[PDB]
Amino acid sequence: MLIEVEKPLPGVEVFVGETAHFEIELSEPDVHGQWKLKGQPLAASPDCEIIEDGKKHILILHNCQLGMTGEVSFQAANTKSAANLKVKELLEHHHHHH
Template sequence: MGFVDPLKDLSVPEKKQAKFECTITKDVSKVIWFRGTEIVTPSPKYEIIDDGKKHMLIINNCEFDDEAQYTIEALGQKSAAQLMVEGMRLSFVQPLQDQTVKEGNSARFDLELSHENVPVVWYRNEVKLHVSRTVLIHVEGKRHTLEMRTLSLDDTCQIKAEAKGIYSMAKLTVVGNCASSFPFHFCFISH
């Protein structure tokens, strides 16, 4: 047994259908499809068509996450091909900007992504931020906002936004409130 028509690499536009096809020299009722090392099973995402010598794997609504090597295995023989998904890659249209704010005030970090419905995870010095009384997170389409309220000098940090493996970072600097009604400046810093 061998492959008359082995699998061929495919490049399809984002959201479109990809169709891997191959023909083998004899009728085989059962073949196994793999995505990388994982076995592919029929689902709304994957359609598997076995028609004697002709075998097809259809991938519906292709996303960038579907890019991988796909392999068919029949009677110990294998054929593999790569799927590439074309389209606009996720990027930061508006990245984060550094901010300097006075102690007791709020800082607001805005960013805009190239795609909608992409989750963003916010970090403060590499520690994941969670919504609280002083931390607010807002999403509207492609725009994501982090608001940090009632800041203290200890809140000076690095802010990072992560979306599907891409990052945008900014520095948050909190400065003390100095009384300037005297010829000399007095800063009262509470510890």
């Protein structure tokens, strides 16, 4: 009856101002969705790509500089979807066995 997420994002991980991969399921390939961000004006930005393979939707966000964490909002057929973003610190530290 009502649209229900099949594979939500209970916790996404990405690099600081690098790449943002987000994929979810709606168990309904008959419809689609849109990705909204407080940073960008709307979805399908000139610096992002929105591909829908089957029923799932993938959104690549470049340069995700929001801070210690970011809040991503996605709408799937008049549906409210919000997940937490974990920004990682780009560190080229060395991991020696000794």
